[PDB]
């Protein structure tokens, strides 16, 4: 199911698949959680790719 850890893995693979750098851009008005969702993306990639 839709989850942040999913967007992170979807990209992190896409990169290694078609060999073409990627970006995860968190939009949303102030407060909407732009930050947290970033801390997760690192959180995930810090274990899933380390």
């Amino acid at each position: 199911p839709p989850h942040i850890y999913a967007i992170a893995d979807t990209a992190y693979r896409s990169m290694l698949q078609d060999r073409e750098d990627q970006s995860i851009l968190c939009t949303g008005e102030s407060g909407a959680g732009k930050t947290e969702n970033t801390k997760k993306v690192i959180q995930y990639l810090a274990v899933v790719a380390s």
């Binding site: 990169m15 290694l16 690192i42």
Partner: protein, 49 residues
Amino acid sequence: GKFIRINFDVTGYIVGANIETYLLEKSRAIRQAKDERTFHIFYYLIAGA
């Protein structure tokens, strides 16, 4: 604003990381608006000291 960059090798492993910081509203370091605070660290220090 902040733009973190993570670097991977060919095997697919994390190896590096950069951080491009932007518009640091350091103004508030001198005067904070109503019901607002300064940069956390300040209070942290005045207390965790």
